[PDB]
Amino acid sequence: NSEEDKQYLIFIKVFQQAMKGNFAKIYAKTEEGKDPPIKKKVERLRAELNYCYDELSFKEYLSDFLVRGGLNKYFNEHQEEIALLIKKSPWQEIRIWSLLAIASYKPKD
Amino acid sequence: NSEEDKQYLIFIKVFQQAMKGNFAKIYAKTEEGKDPPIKKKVERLRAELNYCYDELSFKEYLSDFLVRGGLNKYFNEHQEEIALLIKKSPWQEIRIWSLLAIASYKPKD
Amino acid sequence: NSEEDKQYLIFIKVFQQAMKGNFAKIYAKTEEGKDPPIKKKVERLRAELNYCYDELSFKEYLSDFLVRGGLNKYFNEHQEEIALLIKKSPWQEIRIWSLLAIASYKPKD
Amino acid sequence: PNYYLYGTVLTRYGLASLNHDIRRGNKTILQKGYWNNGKIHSFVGSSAIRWALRFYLQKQGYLVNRVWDEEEHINRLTSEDFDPEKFYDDDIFGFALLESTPNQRMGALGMNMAVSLTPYDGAVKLGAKSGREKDSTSLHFTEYHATRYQYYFGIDATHLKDFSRILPMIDGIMNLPKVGGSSNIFNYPFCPDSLVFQWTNHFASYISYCFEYCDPKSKEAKLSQEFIDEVECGQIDPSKLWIGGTIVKDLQQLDNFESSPLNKAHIYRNRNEMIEALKTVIKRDLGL
Amino acid sequence: PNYYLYGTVLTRYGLASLNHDIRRGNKTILQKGYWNNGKIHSFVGSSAIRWALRFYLQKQGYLVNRVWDEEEHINRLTSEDFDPEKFYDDDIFGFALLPNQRMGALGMNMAVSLTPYDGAVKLGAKSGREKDSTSLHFTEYHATRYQYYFGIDATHLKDFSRILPMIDGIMNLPKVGGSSNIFNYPFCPDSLVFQWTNHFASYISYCFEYCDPKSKEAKLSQEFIDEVECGQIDPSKLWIGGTIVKDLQQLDNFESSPLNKAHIYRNRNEMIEALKTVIKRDLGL
Amino acid sequence: PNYYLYGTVLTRYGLASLNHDIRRGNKTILQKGYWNNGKIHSFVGSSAIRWALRFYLQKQGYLVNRVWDEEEHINRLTSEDFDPEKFYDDDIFGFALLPNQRMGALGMNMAVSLTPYDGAVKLGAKSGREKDSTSLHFTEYHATRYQYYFGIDATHLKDFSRILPMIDGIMNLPKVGGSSNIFNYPFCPDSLVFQWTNHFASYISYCFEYCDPKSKEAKLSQEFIDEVECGQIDPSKLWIGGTIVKDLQQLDNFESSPLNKAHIYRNRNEMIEALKTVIKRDLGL
Amino acid sequence: LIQSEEYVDLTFKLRGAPIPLDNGYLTYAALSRICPPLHELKSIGIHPIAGIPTRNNLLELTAQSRLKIRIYHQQIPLIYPYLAGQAFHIGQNFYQLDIPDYKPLISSESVYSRLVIIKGFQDSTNFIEAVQRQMDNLGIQGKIELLTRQDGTPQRRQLTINKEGKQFKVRGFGVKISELNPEDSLTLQEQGIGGKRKMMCGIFVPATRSKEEEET
């Protein structure tokens, strides 16, 4: 695997951990009812990602989501690489990677 | 590589040092058997960051946060670079950088 | 280049010199084996800077601060232009610059 | 004919925390955005003013399909099928029944968001649950703004099912109830203090936001120089212009006011007299 | 008919430190912000005034839900379920639980200093020796008269007779703010402008203004007098009383002015009695 | 029933230098700020007056938790735990350590000079060890009478009989400021305007004023006289005594004025005795 | 090294619109309108306002710019209530004064005067002998030196008195005096030299101001 592929996979894992944190926060927030929805959360995330229209708005949303995720151990281990990848790469490609991470996400059993 | 990337990375380091200082201050503030904050202080920092409008408010809050962080070597070595970076640049970009620093500060603590 | 940031930088420099002089004066104030605080001095300066309510306040405050700064050479060869800069520009911008100078002051001592 | 009543109303000076934004953290923020000169002004949504108008229509008798309960804070529909012929609110504000007489209506009232005349600088009010015990819901902050508010509206009178329903709408705009907001701690009356109304029969208005500030941190309000130039150049027929409120004193204190074309407009210092004259003209034109 | 009581209350002159901003450091920052003509004015929060009104209701023996302990300095709820029919505080100020909500019949705006805030910081040293955190300290105070605007929706009350205790409490308002040990500031009105009308429109909010930016003298704003003279604000619904009555009567052509037809009483108690008689007649009490 | 004792006390004329502000440089400048008419008046902190009252309580033999050494200049606590039931200090002035706290029945405001500060300064030579060197430093003195406003919540007292020692201490106030009081300025009242009522509202906050900016005599403010005449202040609840009574009795139409039926005594002690009798009757002592 | 008694410097913080550099009658008349007793005082002098020079013949007020008054310390209660906290107008602008601070009169070996006016003496030699005579009247011994511009010429200044419709021309020199010893230095600083002491001229300051004025 090339270094670009390694950083791409690390970013996918970072986004997946952020979604884990956000969905855990939601689950804690809406413990009431039979079960908090999971498909609705994914649809919300997809709609919010597609709402972004330019680089600044998308990167602001991505940073906010990543922070809301929590610890995000994969970002702990890779400060400089992932930070430079987010800062440098075109926002459309980062959105593509984020949506791929959304699609390849496994909810905790 | 590249001067802008180096400045961005060491500004991320500056912000992480500032959050370490602020979190240490919060740790010193609390006492007795009450659990000191770890994560909800990060959530508070996020909420304060998004509570920002126009160039003036965000820069004021960022400068106050950096001063409250106390001692920091990365800002010590680089005065002109970070002073110019903070004074210049759109405030939304600096907020994105601050959030990226937040999401990757935790490996230190 | 673009001497606006030149004025910004030498304002930061003379502010650091003035705060060093005031910390030296505080060192003169204290006595006996009590350890003269350094971080608490910065905290006190930040709190006093945040204590102001526009125009009159913080303008006479920072002028008085610079005056008690003592024999500042960079002030001496930069009297007129720094006075013009202080008279112009919003006061909150001056406060932001001062806070950045505080955050980037230490390596002098 | 196709008669339209356009108007820009300026509220009174006071501390306002009317329309808020997403909850965020412990601090409730106002709805704010860039308005002029790159400065950030606070906004009040037009849906809030429409809700206030609906509440006024409900309180003063009248037939409204939507009835605000005011006790359980619920909305009840007297008839599940909207009937603009019978109900005032359906006739005026329209409706849209999407779940699956026409099911949709365009409404005769068109509003725009109320914009603070003054830029919003600071003005966050600390709030505490008090006591000696402390918890998560103990320390909170609320944003306020000491400013006047100014909004623009237009009425397509011919679009009304009943042509006489415009009069209660004007009365409601005059005696507007509280516009949705933290009235417990920031009581902000939204009744107008200056009016610029135009009762014309063409679509062009040119009176959208005619009020502008002086000394950006002051309560003083003046008519924008663009509006005065529009009146003097020949556009905006003075006979169709109704100006009333506290701006009348400032207008009359202007130099060469008698020679100005603005003097030929219907200018009343008392708002009730101006509203009465305007309603007389409206009743004459609409054949009421 | 929907009846509303609008009013602007002007307090007496004195040294005031009632509401403070976030407390940390040496100075206790007075709650201040911008106001008319772009100068910094000290503020008193409306929540503090509402607390004072509720405390007045408690001290007079009226049945209230929230009770101030005065010993533990905590708030106790007599009933976990709010009942606006029975409790005065729930009926007047509303509640929110998070019917579990109530809009409350009282709407009050923040109190604004008549005079701009210039200086007047106070020294807070604590005796001698042992210069601990309780050592040299600074306290901000303001020498002015505060002014606030309130509005009561009489018909929204569960019990219509409860408006009278609200007026009495506005008259004899208990301690407002915190620095009563060293800055005792009575918040009782010394000038009032009340309006008892059946319209949502109010044109009496913050009707007072200063004659000299550093004097205790107060004067009704020319805007308010112009509003009364033009034809707006029916004088029969206007109730003016307090020390502003003397200044109003010393005005020239006062007899010919429409302001003369308003209910003007130098004695505030007489104004309150007449207004309460009118309110009881209108509400059928 | 709730009972409150509001009062404004006017001190005797003389040179004053009390509660100095920051001793920056060689000068010891007074605590001064703006007052009515936008003129500069010298202030005296209310904390100093509270300390003087507490010291009077200690000296008279009443049991107080805090004791002044008078030699080591150190404040010592008789008991670490505060017991307002037993200690006069904790009952009256309250406590706070940070029932761990108590509000305290006494509430005061800063003493304000009657006449505006004239800017008079005094030259003095302080001692020095540099070969017996004398350095000229500036001290400020104000020749004026001070007036302060205090409020007493009699019901809030744990022991209702403790109000009488407090009144006696207000009358026989010890030296205020202590070492800082360069010229011995007697702070005992020269004229009193007290009010023993059961309402929170008080309109006697600062009722004194000067006829001329440079005078050694005082006059009641026209606002206070108007308040008495209109009927806002109940004459049966009003107590006036001291030198101001002599000026009042020479006013024309005094007998016909409503001010006459108020409790007025030329001698301060007689008024204090009558007021204490009324308080004892009302409080059931 | 000797602080003069019975004489102080009442310094009021000064703020407002940019002010003419040759204020003189403007400031004096504004203060007289605000303070009627200031007209009848005798041994009082008003310091030249210290602020950076702006374009034209105007002077811009800084936060360090302050109105300073030299007055007998027992005569302060005659002008303090009229000036402390009040406001005066120059032309159409409003200027505010706060609570003043007292500055002692320090002795200095070399003293400086911006502007010395003697009636009827315009040339350098007659002016110098006149200041020698004035020293002889008050018994001060010292050497007189005249401030010079970049060209070395003795410096002249003009005072404009706008009394009634007509405007008046009164002129003088700016001297530097040393070899005074502290007692005579304090005597000269309190008494001053020449006339028009309240007219923003004739008073004396240490020689640091002399060098500063010599710079520009």
mmCIF file of C-alpha atoms in Angstrom, chain F:
data_model
loop_
_atom_site.group_PDB
_atom_site.id
_atom_site.type_symbol
_atom_site.label_atom_id
_atom_site.label_comp_id
_atom_site.label_asym_id
_atom_site.label_seq_id
_atom_site.Cartn_x
_atom_site.Cartn_y
_atom_site.Cartn_z
ATOM 1 C CA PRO F 1 -45.328 41.118 61.117
ATOM 2 C CA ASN F 2 -42.268 42.195 59.138
ATOM 3 C CA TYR F 3 -40.755 45.379 60.567
ATOM 4 C CA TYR F 4 -38.011 47.531 59.059
ATOM 5 C CA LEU F 5 -36.023 50.474 60.420
ATOM 6 C CA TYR F 6 -34.758 52.745 57.644
ATOM 7 C CA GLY F 7 -32.676 55.781 58.475
ATOM 8 C CA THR F 8 -30.429 58.512 57.105
ATOM 9 C CA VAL F 9 -27.944 59.928 59.615
ATOM 10 C CA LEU F 10 -25.978 63.150 59.140
ATOM 11 C CA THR F 11 -22.573 63.548 60.759
ATOM 12 C CA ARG F 12 -21.105 66.654 62.375
ATOM 13 C CA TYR F 13 -19.064 69.189 60.433
ATOM 14 C CA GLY F 14 -15.288 68.943 60.546
ATOM 15 C CA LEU F 15 -12.128 68.027 58.708
ATOM 16 C CA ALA F 16 -12.311 64.501 57.301
ATOM 17 C CA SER F 17 -9.798 62.043 55.851
ATOM 18 C CA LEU F 18 -11.304 58.554 55.929
ATOM 19 C CA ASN F 19 -11.088 55.364 53.876
ATOM 20 C CA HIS F 20 -8.409 56.554 51.487
ATOM 21 C CA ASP F 21 -8.108 55.072 48.008
ATOM 22 C CA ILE F 22 -4.915 53.544 46.586
ATOM 23 C CA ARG F 23 -1.886 55.305 48.086
ATOM 24 C CA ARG F 24 -0.188 55.661 44.710
ATOM 25 C CA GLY F 25 2.978 57.750 44.824
ATOM 26 C CA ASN F 26 3.434 60.018 47.836
ATOM 27 C CA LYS F 27 -0.142 61.313 47.936
ATOM 28 C CA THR F 28 -2.925 59.885 50.098
ATOM 29 C CA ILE F 29 -5.959 60.977 48.094
ATOM 30 C CA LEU F 30 -9.572 60.649 49.205
ATOM 31 C CA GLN F 31 -12.258 58.298 47.909
ATOM 32 C CA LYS F 32 -14.227 60.619 45.630
ATOM 33 C CA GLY F 33 -16.664 60.356 42.760
ATOM 34 C CA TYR F 34 -19.686 61.920 41.123
ATOM 35 C CA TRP F 35 -22.899 62.767 42.965
ATOM 36 C CA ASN F 36 -25.953 64.910 42.236
ATOM 37 C CA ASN F 37 -25.446 68.052 40.127
ATOM 38 C CA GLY F 38 -22.508 66.260 38.490
ATOM 39 C CA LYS F 39 -20.026 67.486 41.097
ATOM 40 C CA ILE F 40 -17.264 65.598 42.879
ATOM 41 C CA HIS F 41 -18.109 64.355 46.375
ATOM 42 C CA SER F 42 -15.932 62.428 48.806
ATOM 43 C CA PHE F 43 -17.203 59.001 49.848
ATOM 44 C CA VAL F 44 -16.655 56.813 52.903
ATOM 45 C CA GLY F 45 -17.043 53.072 52.493
ATOM 46 C CA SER F 46 -19.905 51.369 54.293
ATOM 47 C CA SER F 47 -17.625 48.486 55.290
ATOM 48 C CA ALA F 48 -15.743 50.879 57.574
ATOM 49 C CA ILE F 49 -18.993 51.942 59.251
ATOM 50 C CA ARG F 50 -20.038 48.307 59.668
ATOM 51 C CA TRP F 51 -16.659 47.572 61.257
ATOM 52 C CA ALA F 52 -17.123 50.533 63.601
ATOM 53 C CA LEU F 53 -20.566 49.263 64.618
ATOM 54 C CA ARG F 54 -19.178 45.772 65.234
ATOM 55 C CA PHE F 55 -16.364 47.270 67.315
ATOM 56 C CA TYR F 56 -18.943 49.174 69.360
ATOM 57 C CA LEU F 57 -20.781 45.906 69.952
ATOM 58 C CA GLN F 58 -17.537 44.279 71.101
ATOM 59 C CA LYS F 59 -16.510 47.160 73.376
ATOM 60 C CA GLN F 60 -19.883 47.432 75.122
ATOM 61 C CA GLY F 61 -19.503 43.858 76.399
ATOM 62 C CA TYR F 62 -21.990 42.107 74.119
ATOM 63 C CA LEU F 63 -20.898 38.605 73.153
ATOM 64 C CA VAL F 64 -19.384 38.735 69.657
ATOM 65 C CA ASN F 65 -17.677 35.962 67.703
ATOM 66 C CA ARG F 66 -15.043 38.248 66.162
ATOM 67 C CA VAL F 67 -12.832 40.096 68.654
ATOM 68 C CA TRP F 68 -10.460 42.967 67.873
ATOM 69 C CA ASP F 69 -7.139 42.731 69.705
ATOM 70 C CA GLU F 70 -6.553 46.528 69.551
ATOM 71 C CA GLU F 71 -2.832 45.822 70.024
ATOM 72 C CA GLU F 72 -1.737 43.140 67.547
ATOM 73 C CA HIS F 73 -4.263 44.453 64.977
ATOM 74 C CA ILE F 74 -5.409 40.881 64.292
ATOM 75 C CA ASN F 75 -9.022 39.697 64.182
ATOM 76 C CA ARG F 76 -9.598 36.504 66.171
ATOM 77 C CA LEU F 77 -12.648 34.238 66.146
ATOM 78 C CA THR F 78 -14.119 33.007 69.423
ATOM 79 C CA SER F 79 -15.732 30.024 67.674
ATOM 80 C CA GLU F 80 -14.943 28.570 64.262
ATOM 81 C CA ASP F 81 -18.605 27.637 63.785
ATOM 82 C CA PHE F 82 -20.861 30.671 63.370
ATOM 83 C CA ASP F 83 -23.851 30.684 65.747
ATOM 84 C CA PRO F 84 -26.185 33.650 65.127
ATOM 85 C CA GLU F 85 -28.355 32.520 68.048
ATOM 86 C CA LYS F 86 -25.572 33.217 70.562
ATOM 87 C CA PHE F 87 -23.288 35.808 68.924
ATOM 88 C CA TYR F 88 -24.417 39.376 68.282
ATOM 89 C CA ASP F 89 -21.913 39.638 65.421
ATOM 90 C CA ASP F 90 -23.265 36.640 63.513
ATOM 91 C CA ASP F 91 -26.882 37.578 64.229
ATOM 92 C CA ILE F 92 -26.527 41.153 62.982
ATOM 93 C CA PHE F 93 -23.805 41.281 60.331
ATOM 94 C CA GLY F 94 -24.130 37.718 59.034
ATOM 95 C CA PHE F 95 -21.261 35.496 57.991
ATOM 96 C CA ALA F 96 -19.784 33.586 55.063
ATOM 97 C CA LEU F 97 -16.965 31.032 54.970
ATOM 98 C CA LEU F 98 -17.033 29.649 51.395
ATOM 99 C CA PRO F 99 -26.202 27.176 57.808
ATOM 100 C CA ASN F 100 -22.779 28.180 56.480
ATOM 101 C CA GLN F 101 -23.948 31.711 55.617
ATOM 102 C CA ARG F 102 -26.383 34.352 56.839
ATOM 103 C CA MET F 103 -27.599 37.526 55.151
ATOM 104 C CA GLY F 104 -27.601 39.757 58.216
ATOM 105 C CA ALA F 105 -30.263 42.209 59.344
ATOM 106 C CA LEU F 106 -28.097 45.287 58.777
ATOM 107 C CA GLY F 107 -27.803 46.770 55.298
ATOM 108 C CA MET F 108 -25.943 50.016 54.655
ATOM 109 C CA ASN F 109 -24.799 52.352 51.895
ATOM 110 C CA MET F 110 -21.703 54.494 51.493
ATOM 111 C CA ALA F 111 -21.423 57.757 53.393
ATOM 112 C CA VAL F 112 -21.501 60.720 51.002
ATOM 113 C CA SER F 113 -20.144 64.183 51.731
ATOM 114 C CA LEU F 114 -22.857 66.824 51.915
ATOM 115 C CA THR F 115 -20.912 69.510 50.075
ATOM 116 C CA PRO F 116 -18.873 68.921 46.903
ATOM 117 C CA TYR F 117 -15.169 68.308 47.375
ATOM 118 C CA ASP F 118 -13.260 71.590 47.196
ATOM 119 C CA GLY F 119 -9.925 69.977 46.338
ATOM 120 C CA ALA F 120 -8.202 71.179 49.507
ATOM 121 C CA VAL F 121 -4.863 69.474 50.131
ATOM 122 C CA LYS F 122 -2.483 69.473 53.096
ATOM 123 C CA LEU F 123 1.315 69.321 53.178
ATOM 124 C CA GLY F 124 3.019 67.016 55.659
ATOM 125 C CA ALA F 125 6.533 65.704 56.198
ATOM 126 C CA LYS F 126 6.776 61.959 56.808
ATOM 127 C CA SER F 127 9.686 60.374 58.647
ATOM 128 C CA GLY F 128 12.625 58.879 56.779
ATOM 129 C CA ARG F 129 15.754 56.891 57.617
ATOM 130 C CA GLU F 130 17.941 58.491 54.904
ATOM 131 C CA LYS F 131 19.918 60.663 57.336
ATOM 132 C CA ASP F 132 16.697 61.931 58.957
ATOM 133 C CA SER F 133 15.319 63.031 55.588
ATOM 134 C CA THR F 134 11.800 64.466 55.426
ATOM 135 C CA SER F 135 9.879 64.039 52.168
ATOM 136 C CA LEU F 136 6.892 66.268 51.436
ATOM 137 C CA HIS F 137 3.791 64.212 50.645
ATOM 138 C CA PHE F 138 0.218 65.244 49.911
ATOM 139 C CA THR F 139 -2.784 64.359 52.068
ATOM 140 C CA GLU F 140 -6.362 65.280 51.208
ATOM 141 C CA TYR F 141 -8.856 66.580 53.749
ATOM 142 C CA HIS F 142 -12.511 67.484 53.262
ATOM 143 C CA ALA F 143 -14.301 69.864 55.631
ATOM 144 C CA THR F 144 -17.835 68.522 55.314
ATOM 145 C CA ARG F 145 -20.609 66.484 56.897
ATOM 146 C CA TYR F 146 -21.181 62.908 55.747
ATOM 147 C CA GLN F 147 -24.580 61.252 55.408
ATOM 148 C CA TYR F 148 -25.220 57.536 55.011
ATOM 149 C CA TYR F 149 -28.290 55.358 54.556
ATOM 150 C CA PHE F 150 -28.878 52.126 56.465
ATOM 151 C CA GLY F 151 -31.687 49.597 56.536
ATOM 152 C CA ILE F 152 -32.530 47.214 59.379
ATOM 153 C CA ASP F 153 -34.655 44.080 58.997
ATOM 154 C CA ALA F 154 -35.799 43.631 62.592
ATOM 155 C CA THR F 155 -37.682 40.397 61.892
ATOM 156 C CA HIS F 156 -34.580 38.833 60.319
ATOM 157 C CA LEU F 157 -32.782 39.092 63.671
ATOM 158 C CA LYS F 158 -32.557 35.817 65.573
ATOM 159 C CA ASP F 159 -33.104 37.783 68.798
ATOM 160 C CA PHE F 160 -35.519 40.690 68.415
ATOM 161 C CA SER F 161 -33.994 42.553 71.379
ATOM 162 C CA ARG F 162 -30.707 43.030 69.491
ATOM 163 C CA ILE F 163 -32.060 46.028 67.555
ATOM 164 C CA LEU F 164 -31.665 48.352 70.554
ATOM 165 C CA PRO F 165 -27.880 47.806 70.936
ATOM 166 C CA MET F 166 -27.585 48.425 67.195
ATOM 167 C CA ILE F 167 -29.433 51.746 67.472
ATOM 168 C CA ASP F 168 -27.242 52.723 70.423
ATOM 169 C CA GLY F 169 -24.151 51.845 68.399
ATOM 170 C CA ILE F 170 -25.353 53.908 65.453
ATOM 171 C CA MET F 171 -25.805 56.828 67.848
ATOM 172 C CA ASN F 172 -22.502 56.257 69.689
ATOM 173 C CA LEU F 173 -20.405 55.199 66.724
ATOM 174 C CA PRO F 174 -16.700 54.670 67.545
ATOM 175 C CA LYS F 175 -13.821 56.016 65.466
ATOM 176 C CA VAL F 176 -14.125 55.010 61.807
ATOM 177 C CA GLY F 177 -11.063 54.028 59.779
ATOM 178 C CA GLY F 178 -8.794 53.813 62.808
ATOM 179 C CA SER F 179 -5.220 54.571 61.791
ATOM 180 C CA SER F 180 -6.266 56.003 58.415
ATOM 181 C CA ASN F 181 -8.423 58.639 60.157
ATOM 182 C CA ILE F 182 -5.709 61.294 60.360
ATOM 183 C CA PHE F 183 -7.973 63.989 61.781
ATOM 184 C CA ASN F 184 -10.233 62.509 64.452
ATOM 185 C CA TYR F 185 -13.583 62.821 62.698
ATOM 186 C CA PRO F 186 -16.566 62.050 64.962
ATOM 187 C CA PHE F 187 -18.987 59.949 62.938
ATOM 188 C CA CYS F 188 -21.793 60.081 65.505
ATOM 189 C CA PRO F 189 -25.080 61.444 64.116
ATOM 190 C CA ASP F 190 -25.869 65.146 64.220
ATOM 191 C CA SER F 191 -29.311 64.861 62.600
ATOM 192 C CA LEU F 192 -31.458 61.762 62.120
ATOM 193 C CA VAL F 193 -34.352 60.899 59.812
ATOM 194 C CA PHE F 194 -35.588 57.464 60.885
ATOM 195 C CA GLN F 195 -38.590 55.460 59.720
ATOM 196 C CA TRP F 196 -40.106 52.518 61.616
ATOM 197 C CA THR F 197 -42.486 50.963 59.089
ATOM 198 C CA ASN F 198 -43.642 47.556 57.866
ATOM 199 C CA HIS F 199 -43.200 48.255 54.135
ATOM 200 C CA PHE F 200 -40.192 47.508 51.955
ATOM 201 C CA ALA F 201 -40.478 50.925 50.294
ATOM 202 C CA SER F 202 -38.443 53.754 51.818
ATOM 203 C CA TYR F 203 -38.238 57.325 50.519
ATOM 204 C CA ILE F 204 -35.706 58.696 53.021
ATOM 205 C CA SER F 205 -32.539 57.414 51.350
ATOM 206 C CA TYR F 206 -30.581 60.696 51.183
ATOM 207 C CA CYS F 207 -32.873 63.442 52.466
ATOM 208 C CA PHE F 208 -30.203 66.035 53.317
ATOM 209 C CA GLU F 209 -28.785 68.767 51.096
ATOM 210 C CA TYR F 210 -26.748 71.954 51.375
ATOM 211 C CA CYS F 211 -28.163 75.458 51.058
ATOM 212 C CA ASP F 212 -24.836 76.761 49.713
ATOM 213 C CA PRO F 213 -21.826 74.771 48.461
ATOM 214 C CA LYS F 214 -19.703 76.252 51.287
ATOM 215 C CA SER F 215 -21.772 76.029 54.469
ATOM 216 C CA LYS F 216 -21.611 74.334 57.860
ATOM 217 C CA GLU F 217 -25.399 73.905 58.121
ATOM 218 C CA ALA F 218 -27.705 71.397 56.453
ATOM 219 C CA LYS F 219 -31.241 71.499 55.077
ATOM 220 C CA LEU F 220 -33.693 68.726 54.291
ATOM 221 C CA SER F 221 -34.101 68.181 50.564
ATOM 222 C CA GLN F 222 -37.181 69.728 48.981
ATOM 223 C CA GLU F 223 -37.995 66.287 47.570
ATOM 224 C CA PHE F 224 -38.284 64.854 51.088
ATOM 225 C CA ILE F 225 -40.505 67.729 52.227
ATOM 226 C CA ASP F 226 -42.709 67.251 49.162
ATOM 227 C CA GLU F 227 -42.922 63.517 49.877
ATOM 228 C CA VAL F 228 -44.019 64.232 53.446
ATOM 229 C CA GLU F 229 -46.534 66.892 52.390
ATOM 230 C CA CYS F 230 -48.186 64.892 49.599
ATOM 231 C CA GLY F 231 -48.855 62.026 52.018
ATOM 232 C CA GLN F 232 -46.507 59.349 50.656
ATOM 233 C CA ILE F 233 -44.583 59.188 53.946
ATOM 234 C CA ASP F 234 -46.827 58.505 56.926
ATOM 235 C CA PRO F 235 -46.004 61.123 59.600
ATOM 236 C CA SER F 236 -46.762 58.646 62.392
ATOM 237 C CA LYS F 237 -43.904 56.469 61.086
ATOM 238 C CA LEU F 238 -41.434 59.355 60.646
ATOM 239 C CA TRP F 239 -38.828 60.259 63.272
ATOM 240 C CA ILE F 240 -36.679 63.388 62.957
ATOM 241 C CA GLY F 241 -34.186 64.541 65.568
ATOM 242 C CA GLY F 242 -31.014 66.570 65.858
ATOM 243 C CA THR F 243 -29.887 69.956 64.617
ATOM 244 C CA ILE F 244 -32.148 69.792 61.546
ATOM 245 C CA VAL F 245 -35.180 70.054 63.849
ATOM 246 C CA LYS F 246 -34.105 73.561 64.859
ATOM 247 C CA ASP F 247 -34.063 74.659 61.218
ATOM 248 C CA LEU F 248 -37.356 72.871 60.518
ATOM 249 C CA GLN F 249 -39.272 74.543 63.350
ATOM 250 C CA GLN F 250 -38.444 78.024 62.004
ATOM 251 C CA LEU F 251 -40.062 77.258 58.640
ATOM 252 C CA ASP F 252 -43.271 79.132 57.910
ATOM 253 C CA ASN F 253 -46.576 77.238 58.078
ATOM 254 C CA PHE F 254 -44.826 74.502 60.063
ATOM 255 C CA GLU F 255 -47.861 73.938 62.292
ATOM 256 C CA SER F 256 -50.183 73.565 59.295
ATOM 257 C CA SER F 257 -47.668 71.422 57.402
ATOM 258 C CA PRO F 258 -48.004 67.620 57.649
ATOM 259 C CA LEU F 259 -44.376 67.553 58.826
ATOM 260 C CA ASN F 260 -45.522 68.762 62.259
ATOM 261 C CA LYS F 261 -47.434 65.591 63.152
ATOM 262 C CA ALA F 262 -44.278 63.544 62.594
ATOM 263 C CA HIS F 263 -42.248 62.620 65.666
ATOM 264 C CA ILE F 264 -39.886 65.597 65.907
ATOM 265 C CA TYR F 265 -37.481 66.172 68.805
ATOM 266 C CA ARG F 266 -34.737 68.764 69.188
ATOM 267 C CA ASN F 267 -32.806 66.354 71.421
ATOM 268 C CA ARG F 268 -31.517 63.227 69.696
ATOM 269 C CA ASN F 269 -31.645 61.169 72.900
ATOM 270 C CA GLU F 270 -35.347 61.867 73.463
ATOM 271 C CA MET F 271 -36.183 60.790 69.911
ATOM 272 C CA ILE F 272 -34.079 57.645 70.311
ATOM 273 C CA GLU F 273 -35.829 56.788 73.582
ATOM 274 C CA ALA F 274 -39.293 57.307 72.086
ATOM 275 C CA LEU F 275 -38.414 55.249 69.008
ATOM 276 C CA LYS F 276 -37.010 52.454 71.173
ATOM 277 C CA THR F 277 -40.206 52.466 73.236
ATOM 278 C CA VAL F 278 -42.265 52.173 70.043
ATOM 279 C CA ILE F 279 -40.022 49.375 68.743
ATOM 280 C CA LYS F 280 -40.274 47.453 72.017
ATOM 281 C CA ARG F 281 -44.059 47.822 71.967
ATOM 282 C CA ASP F 282 -44.308 46.640 68.353
ATOM 283 C CA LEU F 283 -41.768 43.809 68.625
ATOM 284 C CA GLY F 284 -43.281 42.489 71.862
ATOM 285 C CA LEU F 285 -40.146 42.902 73.975
#
